[PDB]
Design a protein around this ligand. Structure first.
Ligand code: PRO
Length: 360
């Protein structure tokens, strides 16, 4: 019977299907099919409440591993029994480079939220910083920003000169600066950008939209996920990524309880093989997302140039390359799992105010 994996489409799903989905299906004799979504838990909640679950494995935001575990949607793993050791025998829990954020999480890749511009359209002045993203005088034009508050509030505060620490024990220091007053400042900063006649905002929802909007000249700068910009660059689109105040984030799979392949063990078998050392390394032959396992990272580095063409080195494009980390923010999934409802109410009220004050 087939196992249904849910992911984000475009270049990301392609990297997964080619890197580890199709190889897993061929090795196990369990078909592995892919469904596109745009994140969150609303679809799976609807399926679960209807008693009509068709999804088996979901590629999810870090915060949704926590929420989906707490809501009883996802299966709590027994990590070293369920996931494969590294080839040298290292247990999975010691090969994955840090701890899981929830008992329902297993890592796949690391990715960055950053921004890009179209070097052929932007003009002679070139954006170089997150402050430039917000600078409508030096860089007039529309911006594309993510539809949700998550990531936007962080970059807004850093653009306001509030300091992030990057990764360290306890998470990024930025989040202690995101209580009520900090959230209000961040909302005001986004509102300012989106209401400026020399700015304005398109809210993106799907990962392919930022590179497409830049390729077509619809915005001058767009936030997005670095792998989506990387894919467009490798297709010949003259985008340039800016890594100042990039947000380093961690992605996971979760196993859906009571999905079609749950009781018979088929979904778990697929998941264990997809998240193997070889599987996670294989995905990085296609997209600039870093494998979660130390063993997979070592394979990629030893195998450079690791890109599918046997020519392009992948390490300099990774979210975790030292050059790309110089001013990064580390995403905090507990913050968003805990606070997204309260914050989203204010965020959506801000967005509704943009329209009610907009004159055609
Ligand atoms: O779709 C993408 O490119 C990013 C990577 C993790 C999931 N979202």
């Amino acid at each position: 019977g087939a196992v249904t994996v849910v992911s984000w489409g475009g270049a990301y799903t392609e990297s997964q299907k080619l890197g580890y989905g199709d190889p897993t299906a061929a090795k196990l004799g369990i078909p592995v099919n892919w469904v596109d979504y745009t994140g969150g838990l609303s679809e799976i909640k609807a399926q679960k409440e209807a008693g009509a679950i068709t999804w088996d494995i979901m590629d999810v935001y870090a915060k949704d591993t926590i929420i989906g575990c707490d809501e009883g949607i996802f299966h709590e793993f027994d990590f070293d029994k369920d996931f494969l050791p590294a080839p040298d025998g290292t247990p999975a829990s010691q090969d994955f480079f840090t701890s899981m954020p929830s008992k329902c999480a297993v890592g796949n890749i690391l990715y960055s939220w950053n921004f890009a511009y179209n070097d052929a359209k932007i003009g002679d002045k070139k954006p170089k910083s997150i402050k430039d993203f917000f600078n409508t005088k030096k860089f007039p034009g529309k911006r594309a920003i993510y539809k949700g508050a998550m990531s936007n509030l962080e970059i807004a505060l850093v653009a306001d000169g509030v300091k992030a620490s990057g990764a360290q024990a306890g998470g990024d220091l930025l989040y202690r600066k995101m209580e009520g007053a900090g959230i209000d400042r961040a909302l005001a900063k986004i509102k300012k950008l989106c209401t400026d006649p020399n700015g304005g905002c398109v809210f993106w929802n799907a990962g392919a939209q930022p590179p497409e909007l830049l390729a077509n000249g619809e915005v001058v700068m767009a936030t997005g996920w670095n792998g989506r910009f990387f894919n467009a660059q490798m297709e010949g689109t003259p985008l340039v990524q800016v890594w100042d105040a990039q947000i380093l984030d961690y992605e996971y799979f979760a196993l859906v309880k009571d999905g079609p392949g749950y009781a018979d063990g088929s979904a778990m078998k697929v998941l264990a093989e997809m998240t193997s050392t070889e599987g996670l390394a294989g995905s990085a032959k296609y997209i600039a997302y870093a494998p979660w396992r130390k063993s997979s990272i070592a394979i990629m580095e030893a195998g450079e140039p690791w890109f599918k063409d046997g020519k392009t080195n992948m390490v300099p494009h990774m979210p975790t390359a030292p050059s790309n980390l110089k001013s990064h923010i580390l995403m905090n999934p507990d913050y968003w799992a805990d606070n997204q409802d309260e914050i989203n109410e204010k965020w959506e009220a801000m967005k509704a105010g943009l329209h009610h004050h907009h004159h055609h």
